[PDB]
């Protein structure tokens, strides 16, 4: 959850150089990002997730 | 093959896919001061994790008509983290280096750079009997720039690409650790430069140890549809650092 | 190196020179039904030469603005040779698969596809309480097509690229056997998908086993002089096929 | 020194073929030249070099 | 890999970085005449350094519409150094060869050549009952040229690309040592042709031993911005040369 006592880090991507591209090629491109976990990843307490937002039953 | 090279130093890792090689100075790998060459007697501080890591300097552009760059390198890292702090609070400093220069270009581009690491590059002034200011030999991570003509400014370094500042023949400037970033094969250039000096441990503000010179020989020639802005990014990392003589802050 | 890959299945051979790898499902290679899992009792027919071979489906084009495709795959091979006949005349069918997707582009093109083989991809309808027709979930080898906006047609599948039809988050759709046809390195993509089902031998008309989804993430961007029409060709081949319960023709 | 009794050789570079370059690339390029010595190179007599041209002292 | 090939013969070295292979004739490497096949009795001169070396012939251009070239090859080296002198002063000559053909092009070019070394390529005349002059079958290092249409000149070789001069089917002309310079992969082509003849030592002026034929199949097609002039350079080198019967100069 969002709190103040435990903050993690701030990913920030930066141009080390620019993008040098030759002629008759488009200028702009697309970078993708993936995410996963390493060998020592863990979770501890169960709860309900804040994404379930229902009102009544599903008849 | 041996085009993919990785370098891990502390908490910063450079991975390149079109490198050339690693030029290890004059064959000698960086090392701490063995006590056959010991001069001072108090215990030095060797941080080894918060110091031996890659620090990124400023990035400069390379148009069709650019002439060169030079960085003094015990001075351009004056204010880059705890290397900068442990430069300030001490009196004698000894460290190796590891230069890496990023510069990329597509296959429809051409050109060639030259990355030479000249020790003790004492430069001549523009006028004959004028005192150079400190803010023209170096500007920290802000790069200086050669001028291809006969430069005639006041309190300024003699900017001429056909003299390399020292008055040497710039074609003969390849006796030092040099690599060629020809843009058709290579993505970067790596120079591992050990600490060459006549004294075992020297100060890091009064003395400019060496000068990294990037001088383009083959100009950045390309078509009328390609991307104009092709930057040059330089990132170095000290090695085997140690610091002698802790004192109060400042330099004067 | 391991970029040149050949696959021989029966009397049809795919040779590619810029492949990536072969993703073998969830590690399990296709196999016939061992008799620890045997349910029915009559002898099945295993053709193994006239069935385990590459069948080519229809080819679709990929412009700058195309959104996606999906094929149901026990149904798109309804009328492809003796796999189609032995689908029709029997009652229970068990087979693995081997997906291969051809799509080529030059070095001055860019873009990236995503080839995911989702089991049991039960899709939601466009309207909330409407019955989907059979000719919109599949059309045989004729490919369906996603729509990038909020599709609101009648008797139609909910076409939205940011939901993948099932209402899942389409970025999280990579848990399955997936490969990335990034057009800068790869010529094709190969998925060897074993038969995952809760029953050992199932029918091949009532049940849609899985759905091959090609969804472009990086759009086909290119210059003003290159070739516009860049097709996408898909060719699969069943593996370890067997058929139980021969009966009279038809399906009703 | 320049003399007549000992002459060496005449380097001359020649197009074996031309330069075939595809479209949207510049036509002209740059060749560089390097020079060095092999394993059996030697020098024999010292002298002063003809490059030192001074007039007075450097006060 | 085996794309980088070097050939050292005497005092001339060819280094290529995108070669294909070396086709060694019909398997037989060049050799001096062993004395089981000896006919004449006086001692022959084997220079082996001033003869077995690469001699460069004239360079010809390849436009979009060029049709072919042919060189006779005991005659095109009539006046190339001491091979030419030792051709003139003797009466019988025996030598192998080593063909190398330079032709380079960028990646945005396409086209394909065909380098066939045909022994005893006796050519038909343009008219039916006309005597060919000596200056049309060969011109020394000056290359002759095929004409794609039905050539009908006087005292001229029958120039037709679909007959290869001899009246053979030019598609069937690949039984000989042949290589394909397809411009997408290859920089050159190498043919090591041994000396095939019905007599052990033959004269080198009366007899035309063979004909090197370069005939383009895929025409030099390229964009509207690339470099038009793409030359073709041919450089051969005799092997295992020897010369019998020294006499006064000339030929008549």
mmCIF file of N, CA and C in Angstrom, chain C residues 107-108, chain E residues 107-108:
data_model
loop_
_atom_site.group_PDB
_atom_site.id
_atom_site.type_symbol
_atom_site.label_atom_id
_atom_site.label_comp_id
_atom_site.label_asym_id
_atom_site.label_seq_id
_atom_site.Cartn_x
_atom_site.Cartn_y
_atom_site.Cartn_z
ATOM 1 N N UNK C 107 15.644 -4.464 -43.723
ATOM 2 C CA UNK C 107 16.287 -3.818 -42.592
ATOM 3 C C UNK C 107 15.821 -2.384 -42.393
ATOM 4 N N UNK C 108 15.272 -1.743 -43.421
ATOM 5 C CA UNK C 108 14.749 -0.390 -43.280
ATOM 6 C C UNK C 108 13.307 -0.357 -42.787
ATOM 7 N N UNK E 107 24.707 -2.915 -50.037
ATOM 8 C CA UNK E 107 23.573 -3.766 -49.722
ATOM 9 C C UNK E 107 22.293 -3.317 -50.411
ATOM 10 N N UNK E 108 22.203 -2.058 -50.831
ATOM 11 C CA UNK E 108 21.030 -1.581 -51.552
ATOM 12 C C UNK E 108 21.110 -1.832 -53.053
#
